[PDB]
Amino acid sequence: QPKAAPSVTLFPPSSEELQANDATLVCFISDFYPGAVTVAWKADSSPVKAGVETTTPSKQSNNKYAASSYLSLTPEQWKSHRSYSCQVTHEGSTVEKTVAP
């Protein structure tokens, strides 16, 4: 099967979740093959590992894989940095997406 690089979309915390005193960033990784990816998060430029959870990649109906990664923060953590990023490494490529509060 032909190799396919992932599409990456990073979603900031919803207004609703922030008003519920929580914050979750959601990194959606889609349409990649083969199924092996590594995900790293950054707050501004600094690598972060606390509060990160990542799904095992799962085959979709298009025979490619999709996965999600989540970064759990407090609303105060979210608002205190200039940006957050999710970096996805697949087959010699890393793709990074960045969001701002």
Binding site: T9, F11, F28
Partner: protein, 101 residues
Amino acid sequence: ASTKGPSVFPLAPSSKSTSGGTAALGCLVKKYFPEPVTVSWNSGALTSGVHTTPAVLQSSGLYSLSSFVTVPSSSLGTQTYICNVNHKPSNTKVDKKVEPK
């Protein structure tokens, strides 16, 4: 049996979740117990471009998952997008309208 129904938050489409006229949007299904949760979009009318990833289990013992769809950006603000979440163990269903930012 002990159960906990999910909290559902929108992952809103915006210029920042859109690439080349295709927008991604989703719903985040937080902190439910036990498995499973199932997700549909617009009551099963929207199936093309839908990806629902496996749940992650947190140290709290509660599960979270997310579901996503990619749609034409020209549809945003015109077509209604609703994620339908079913958590049979707690006899709960949640519909969340996902609106542009």
